Design a protein around this ligand. Structure first.
Ligand SMILES: [Ca+2]
Ligand SMILES: [Ca+2]
Length: 154
C-alpha cells in the first residue's frame, strides 16, 4: 500500500475506465478513480521517478473520472506544474512518453508534442510494444481533436 503501489493502481484503474449508461457499477468505478486521485493529490515526492508516476496517475485519474467538484481543473494545473518541474530530468521511458502525451493534451504545448515525437522515433517501427502502439494512438487523437469547432461538418 506504498505511494508507488497506489499510483500504479490508479494508473491501471484510470486506463481501465477510459478504455471501457449510468449503472451503480459505472458510478462506483468513476467514484473510486476520483477518490483515489483525491487521496494521492496531497502527496509530494522528492524522487523524480516516484514523482513522475504520482503525477501521471493523478493526470490520468482526473481525466478518466466523470466527476468534477468544480476544483478539478485547478488541481490538473497543479499537477502539470509538478510535471514541468521534473520533465527535463526524466530519462527516456514509457513513463516519460505518457507524461509528455498527457501533458500535451492539457496544454497543447507544441514543445511537448515535439519531444514526444522524438521519443517515438527512438522505437522500432517493426516491433512496437502494445503500450507504445496505444500511446502513439492517444497522442495522434489529442493532436487531431485540439479544436471541437474543427470537427468535420455532417
Ligand atoms: Ca513526500
Ligand atoms: Ca480539458
Amino acid at each position: 500500500n506504498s505511494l508507488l503501489s497506489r499510483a500504479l493502481e490508479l494508473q491501471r484503474m484510470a486506463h481501465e475506465l477510459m478504455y471501457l449508461i449510468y449503472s451503480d457499477e459505472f458510478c462506483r468505478l468513476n467514484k473510486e478513480v476520483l477518490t483515489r486521485s483525491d487521496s494521492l493529490f496531497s502527496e509530494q515526492s522528492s524522487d523524480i521517478e516516484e514523482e513522475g508516476n504520482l503525477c501521471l496517475a493523478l493526470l490520468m485519474g482526473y481525466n478518466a473520472t466523470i466527476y468534477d467538484n468544480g476544483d478539478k481543473e485547478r488541481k490538473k494545473q497543479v499537477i502539470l506544474d509538478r510535471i514541468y518541474n521534473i520533465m527535463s530530468q526524466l530519462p527516456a521511458s514509457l513513463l516519460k512518453m505518457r507524461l509528455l502525451t498527457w501533458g500535451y493534451s492539457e496544454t497543447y504545448d507544441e514543445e511537448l508534442a515535439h519531444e514526444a515525437h522524438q521519443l517515438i522515433e527512438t522505437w522500432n517501427i517493426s516491433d512496437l510494444t502494445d503500450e507504445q502502439k496505444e500511446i502513439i494512438e492517444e497522442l495522434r487523437n489529442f493532436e487531431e481533436n485540439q479544436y471541437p469547432w474543427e470537427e468535420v461538418q455532417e
